């Protein structure tokens, strides 16, 4: 799972955001197609950052206290 | 002993552990005393504002909580034959958090006194009080952050 | 006598307050004596203009005076008031955003972006599922019982909690999401997916082992980082770069409201003189840093065999010593770096 | 005229003078060997003192300016609570001062590494110890100075804005100058530590 | 927030896991009371604000 | 429909009200309980003490003074106000079709002016007798001392 | 007895039951986050049993205070 899985998730998130922007209820349309779109955007951005920092790490977990029964 | 691990190396670690809690506690004490004088002066007339005016002493307390955190973290990094590197790491963490929380507690005390007084005269000053007071708290927070960064390198 | 007063004094005060307010409004009318008319003026939303016309038509029917009662809407250069029509949901966010200051007439309302951005910055800073769950329960205790705490006296602190109930609800929910990404429920981590890090096959008790990257953790921080003595290094790198990236994104999104305001106010001069050069400066420095962070994550340095650049050192050298790129992040980085420096200067 | 602090100042001055004359006259002037003190002393004391004093003095200056200008603007806010949000840029620029110290502390903590005993007191390790020490002091003290200055200026700005909103604008320029001072301090600290290698 | 939560967990509730018997049960109950009181007070409320 | 005003503030229009002087009070009530008009202060450059309706405010402000004095007296003697929902039921707070108070406001002014003096009189009586009450209580406490 | 104390202890004991139950389960299943360290208790199920007993103590408190709600 290289960088392009982030792009794929971006694609599906963008599809959802455009779809909802089209289908936002008319009663509170601005509130809907602002709050839902911004939640999708920020949730995706934070997830992508969390995934990317782990994608090609420059630091690996390092500890001395791991109990040997968990080596499986 | 060794050149890297002198017998006097744990002195810096122990004194940093002491320094964190001590200076954060004096900062918190100044904040609590000043803001509590403000609260007691204010709430003679308007005791209804007790649970608003209590915020500055609470923030002073969280300063000492940051100091406690750092002191505990550096304390469990101490050892008899610990390196001089980790000794000065612990010293730097304790000194940074202590001095930062001391300054933050002084600022919190003064700002909280002024704020409780004003927000008793002018209720719209509550948000102003608290938003300045958080900006004073964040300085002790920054000192905590530096202490954590340093302590992450202890051994 | 005082008991007789108590049963009706409140209604007397309400009526007298209304009547005094009525005359204080009438003062703001120009009393034309020759025409024997109060020439009043007032701001009303245009969508409510019809309502005003209807209701005055109803009162004149009540009085039967058949007077013109002229609702003469007129053009003016005066700055109109800033009315934001808020539901129970967005009312708290509007109140917190306009406590700083009330928006210019018909400029973009910051409260609508705030609805999401304020709780979610709170969540990024807060970032625990146990504490986010506690906050969500606290908020729901106000939102589910909303009709009971409404029409009820609330004091001040509890009133503040109630008026922010949806603010606190979004804080709790986004904090649960953030703690999921931080992989924090209280102090402890979740182990719901296979870790991307696998420990060595065997080790002696007390041995300083190092994990190996069998993969990448799907969503959230890998639970293999829990309890590791270098957890702080990776967590700090992650959270610091997250702060920089998301702060840049939020600043850019808010700054594009400047472009939208200039477009709405037909102020192309603000677009060309202010928006375009400020955008070029902001991107060419800090958005460069942002795309640079994501690119550095996008490159497998250990597999490429190239030295991982000192990203903050490179940002510093972008200004204090241009051209002498220390570790080449990407080809022609020196030319692009000095071009961005010159563009920001220009 | 007497004060305990000045009494100790003069006492320690006299003691140091007498000790120096004693060492010099007996031919042991080289025993007071501040250079050998710099050589023998652990570089980590210098480095971690640099970081700790950087962030500590940055926070001291930030907090000092913060309570100056915050107390002034809360007092001025009693009649005009509008002053709070308008003059809060003063608190902001005071806090930015401490953020500078935090950034410099991060940069310098990147330099902290376990140097080998065989290479402990080399030219590079001593250089980086002194560099981090004095760069942290430079950034921290400049930040302390700038935070106090910005707090004084923002207090004056809040009070003037309470007097009249038109007087606020040109004092914000003074606050900008105060912030530029701290920014210059930060960049000079970066330049001082720019060529300082890690501990090796 | 992460470090305060971890330190509070270590100081308050994790100590109780080390003792057993009815003294262990009592320590678990009381130390959970302390842990939750400080979590709501210090972490959720004091630091959420 | 009414345009949502959350992305940008609602579009305002300035309305000039040509109100016949005879129906001014009723009209002011109508569009005040309607609740969508923010009035411009056309008389901003006229000193308040010489403004058009200053005396009508002054008499009602005296009435409000008298009512808050009554509230102070009720607190002094520990009586709780009714605070009934009759005003809430009458004032729709979202419905503009409510009739204003008639001549009853003049009755309020007269009643208030009379009743204030009535309360002053009886308060002075009760206060004077209470003063001599306290004085004679102190006298008794002095006399109760055996030695 | 009072409604305020009843609600406070009811809520605290509900969180006690839930959280100590899940902690006891994670100790009983030898979850790494609770047992994987040398510094953790050496025998998962043993401490799981006492955490479960504490969860039952908070269950008693929860049910009792419900009887006074």
Swiss-Prot record, chain A:
Residues 1-2, 56-72 are lumenal. The chain crosses the membrane at residues 3-23, 35-55. Residues 24-34 are cytoplasmic. Its main location: membrane. InterPro entries: ATPase_V0-cplx_e1/e2_su. It is a multi-pass membrane protein. One of its GO terms (biological process) is endosomal lumen acidification. It is found in: Vacuole membrane. The keyword Electron transport does not apply. GO terms for molecular function: ATPase-coupled ion transmembrane transporter activity; proton-transporting ATPase activity, rotational mechanism. One of its GO terms (cellular component) is vacuolar proton-transporting V-type ATPase complex. The keyword Membrane applies. Keywords: Hydrogen ion transport, Ion transport, Membrane, Transmembrane, Transmembrane helix, Transport, Vacuole. Belongs to the V-ATPase e1/e2 subunit family. V-ATPase is a heteromultimeric enzyme composed of a peripheral catalytic V1 complex (components A to H) attached to an integral membrane V0 proton pore complex (components: a, c, c', c'', d, e, f and VOA1). PANTHER family: V-TYPE PROTON ATPASE SUBUNIT, VACUOLAR ATP SYNTHASE SUBUNIT H. Subunit of the V0 complex of vacuolar(H+)-ATPase (V-ATPase), a multisubunit enzyme composed of a peripheral complex (V1) that hydrolyzes ATP and a membrane integral complex (V0) that translocates protons. V-ATPase is responsible for acidifying and maintaining the pH of intracellular compartments. This is V-type proton ATPase subunit e. It comes from Saccharomyces cerevisiae (strain ATCC 204508 / S288c) (Baker's yeast). The lineage of its organism: Eukaryota, Fungi, Dikarya, Ascomycota, Saccharomycotina.
Curated annotation (Swiss-Prot), chain D:
Residues 23-48, 109-131, 192-200 are cytoplasmic. The lineage of its organism: Eukaryota, Fungi, Dikarya, Ascomycota, Saccharomycotina. Signal peptide: none annotated. It comes from the Eukaryota. This is V-type proton ATPase subunit c''. The gene is VMA16. It is found in: Vacuole membrane. V-ATPase is a heteromultimeric enzyme composed of a peripheral catalytic V1 complex (components A to H) attached to an integral membrane V0 proton pore complex (components: a, c, c', c'', d, e, f and VOA1). The decameric c-ring forms the proton-conducting pore, and is composed of eight proteolipid subunits c, one subunit c' and one subunit c''. Residues 70-87, 153-170 are vacuolar. GO terms for molecular function: P-type proton-exporting transporter activity; proton-transporting ATPase activity, rotational mechanism. It comes from Saccharomyces cerevisiae (strain ATCC 204508 / S288c).
Curated annotation (Swiss-Prot), chain F:
Present with 55714 molecules/cell in log phase SD medium. It comes from the Eukaryota. V-ATPase is a heteromultimeric enzyme composed of a peripheral catalytic V1 complex (components A to H) attached to an integral membrane V0 proton pore complex (components: a, c, c', c'', d, e, f and VOA1). This is V-type proton ATPase subunit a, vacuolar isoform. The lineage of its organism: Eukaryota, Fungi, Dikarya, Ascomycota, Saccharomycotina. Residues 115-143 form a coiled coil. Subunit of the V0 complex of vacuolar(H+)-ATPase (V-ATPase), a multisubunit enzyme composed of a peripheral complex (V1) that hydrolyzes ATP and a membrane integral complex (V0) that translocates protons. V-ATPase is responsible for acidifying and maintaining the pH of intracellular compartments. Is present only in vacuolar V-ATPase complexes; enzymes containing this subunit have a 4-fold higher ratio of proton transport to ATP hydrolysis than complexes containing the Golgi/endosomal isoform and undergo reversible dissociation of V1 and V0 in response to glucose depletion. Belongs to the V-ATPase 116 kDa subunit family. It comes from Saccharomyces cerevisiae (strain ATCC 204508 / S288c). It is found in: Vacuole membrane. The chain holds residues 3 to 149 of 840 of the full protein. Glycosylated. The gene is VPH1.
Swiss-Prot record, chain G:
One of its GO terms (molecular function) is proton-transporting ATPase activity, rotational mechanism. It is a multi-pass membrane protein. Residues 28-50 are cytoplasmic. It is found in: Endoplasmic reticulum membrane; Vacuole membrane. The keyword Transmembrane helix applies. Residues 1-6 are lumenal. It comes from the Eukaryota. One of its GO terms (cellular component) is endoplasmic reticulum membrane. GO terms for biological process: endosomal lumen acidification; Golgi lumen acidification; proton transmembrane transport; vacuolar acidification. The chain crosses the membrane at residues 7-27, 51-69. Keywords: Endoplasmic reticulum, Membrane, Transmembrane, Transmembrane helix, Vacuole. Accessory component of the V0 complex of vacuolar(H+)-ATPase (V-ATPase), a multisubunit enzyme composed of a peripheral complex (V1) that hydrolyzes ATP and a membrane integral complex (V0) that translocates protons. V-ATPase is responsible for acidifying and maintaining the pH of intracellular compartments. V-ATPase is a heteromultimeric enzyme composed of a peripheral catalytic V1 complex (components A to H) attached to an integral membrane V0 proton pore complex (components: a, c, c', c'', d, e, f and VOA1). This is V-type proton ATPase subunit f.
């Amino acid at each position: 799972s290289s960088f392009y899985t982030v792009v794929g998730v971006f694609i599906v998130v963008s599809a959802m955001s455009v779809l909802f922007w089209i289908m936002a209820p008319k009663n509170n349309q601005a509130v809907w197609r602002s709050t839902v779109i911004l939640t999708l955007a920020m949730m995706f951005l934070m997830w992508a950052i969390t995934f990317l920092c782990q994608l090609h790490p420059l630091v690996a977990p390092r500890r001395s206290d791991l109990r040997p029964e968990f080596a499986e | 002993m060794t050149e890297l691990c002198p017998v006097y190396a744990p002195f810096f670690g122990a004194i940093g552990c002491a320094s964190a809690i001590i200076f954060t506690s004096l900062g918190a004490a100044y904040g609590t005393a000043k803001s509590g004088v403000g609260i007691c002066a204010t709430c003679v007339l308007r005791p209804d504002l007790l649970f608003k005016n209590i915020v500055p002493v609470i923030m002073a307390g969280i300063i000492a909580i940051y100091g406690l955190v750092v002191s505990v973290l550096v304390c469990y990094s101490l050892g008899q034959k610990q390196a001089l590197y980790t000794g000065f790491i612990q010293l730097g963490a304790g000194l940074s958090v202590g001095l930062s929380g001391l300054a933050a507690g002084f600022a919190i005390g003064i700002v909280g006194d002024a704020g409780v007084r004003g927000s008793s005269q002018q209720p719209r000053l509550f948000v102003g009080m608290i938003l300045i007071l958080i900006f004073a708290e964040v300085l002790g927070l920054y000192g905590l952050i530096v202490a954590l960064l340093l302590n992450s390198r202890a051994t | 006598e005082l008991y007789a007063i108590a049963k009706e004094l409140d209604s007397w005060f309400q009526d007298v307050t209304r009547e005094k307010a009525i005359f204080e409004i009438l003062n703001k009318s120009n009393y034309d004596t020759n025409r024997k008319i109060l020439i009043a003026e007032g701001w009303i939303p245009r969508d409510e203009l019809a309502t005003l016309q209807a209701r005055l038509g109803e009162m004149i029917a009540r009085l039967g005076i058949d007077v013109p009662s002229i609702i003469q809407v007129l053009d003016t250069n005066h700055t109109p008031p800033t009315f934001h029509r808020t539901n129970k949901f967005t009312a708290g966010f509007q109140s917190i955003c306009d406590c700083y200051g009330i928006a210019q007439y018909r400029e973009i309302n910051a409260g609508l972006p705030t609805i999401v951005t304020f709780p979610f910055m709170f969540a990024i800073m807060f970032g625990d599922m146990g504490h986010g769950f506690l906050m969500t329960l606290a908020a729901l205790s106000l939102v589910l019982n909303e009709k009971k705490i409404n029409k009820m006296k609330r004091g001040e602190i509890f009133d503040m909690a109630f008026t922010g109930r949806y603010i606190i609800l979004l804080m709790g929910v986004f904090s649960m999401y953030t703690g999921f990404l931080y992989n924090d429920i209280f102090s402890k981590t979740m182990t719901i997916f296979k870790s991307g890090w696998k420990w060595p096959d065997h080790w002696k008790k007390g041995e300083s082992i190092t994990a190996t990257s069998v993969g990448t953790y799907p969503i959230g921080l890998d639970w293999a980082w829990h309890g590791t003595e270098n957890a702080l290094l990776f967590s700090n790198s992650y959270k610091m770069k997250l702060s920089i990236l998301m702060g840049f994104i939020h600043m850019t999104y808010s700054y594009f409201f400047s472009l939208a305001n200039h477009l709405y106010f037909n102020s192309m001069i603000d677009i060309i003189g202010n928006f375009i050069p400020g955008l070029l400066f902001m991107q060419g420095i800090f958005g460069y840093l942002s795309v640079c962070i994501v690119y550095k994550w996008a490159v497998d340095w250990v597999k490429d065999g190239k030295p991982a650049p000192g990203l903050l050192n490179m940002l510093i050298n972008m200004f204090l010593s241009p051209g002498t790129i220390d570790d080449e992040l990407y080809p022609h980085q020196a030319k692009v770096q000095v071009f961005l420096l010159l563009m920001a200067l220009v | 005229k007497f004060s305990f602090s000045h009494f100790l100042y003069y006492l320690v001055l006299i003691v140091v003078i007498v000790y120096g004359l004693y060492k010099l006259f007996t031919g042991h002037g080289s025993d007071i060997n501040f250079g050998k003190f710099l050589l023998r002393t652990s570089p980590y004391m210098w480095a971690n003192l640099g970081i700790a004093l950087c962030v500590g003095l940055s926070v001291v200056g930030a907090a000092w300016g913060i309570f100056i200008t915050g107390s002034s603007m809360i007092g001025a806010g009693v009649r005009a609570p509008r002053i709070t949000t308008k003059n809060l840029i003063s608190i902001i620029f005071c806090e930015v001062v401490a953020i500078y110290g935090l950034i410099i502390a991060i940069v310098f903590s990147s330099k902290l590494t376990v140097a080998t005993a065989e290479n402990m007191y080399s030219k590079s390790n001593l250089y980086t110890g002194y560099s981090l020490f004095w760069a942290g002091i430079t950034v921290g003290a400049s930040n302390l100075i700038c935070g106090i200055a910005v707090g004084i200026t923002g207090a004056t700005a809040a009070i003037s804005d309470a007097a009249d909103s038109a007087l606020f604008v040109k004092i914000l320029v003074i606050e900008i100058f105060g912030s530029i001072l701290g920014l210059l301090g930060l960049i000079v600290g970066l330049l001082m530590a720019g060529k300082a290698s890690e501990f090796q | 927030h992460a470090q305060l939560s971890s330190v509070l967990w270590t100081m308050t509730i994790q100590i109780a896991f080390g003792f057993r018997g009815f003294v262990g049960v009592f320590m678990t109950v009381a130390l959970f009371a302390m842990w939750f009181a400080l979590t709501c007070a210090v972490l959720v409320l004091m630091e959420g604000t | 429909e009414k345009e949502e005003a959350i992305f940008r503030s609602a579009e305002m229009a300035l309305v000039q009200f040509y109100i016949p002087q005879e129906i001014s009070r009723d009209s002011a009530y109508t569009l005040g309980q309607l609740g969508l008009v923010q009035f411009r202060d056309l008389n901003s450059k006229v000193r308040a003490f010489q403004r058009t309706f200053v005396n009508e405010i002054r008499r009602l402000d005296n009435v409000e003074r008298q009512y808050r004095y009554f509230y102070s007296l009720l607190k002094k003697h520990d009586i709780k106000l009714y605070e009934g929902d009759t005003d809430k039921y009458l004032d729709g707070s979202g419905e503009l079709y409510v009739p204003p108070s008639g001549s009853v406001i003049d009755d309020y002014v007269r009643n208030a002016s009379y009743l204030e003096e009535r309360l002053i009189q009886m308060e002075d009586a009760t206060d004077q007798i209470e003063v001599q009450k306290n004085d004679l209580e102190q006298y008794r406490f002095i006399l109760q001392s055996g030695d | 007895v009072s409604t305020g104390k009843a609600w406070c202890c009811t809520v605290l004991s509900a969180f006690g039951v839930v959280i100590l139950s899940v902690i006891a389960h994670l100790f009983n299943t030898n979850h790494e986050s609770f047992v994987g360290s040398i510094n953790d208790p050496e025998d998962g199920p043993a401490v799981a049993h006492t955490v479960y007993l504490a969860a039952l103590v908070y269950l008693v408190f929860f049910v009792f205070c419900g009887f006074q709600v």
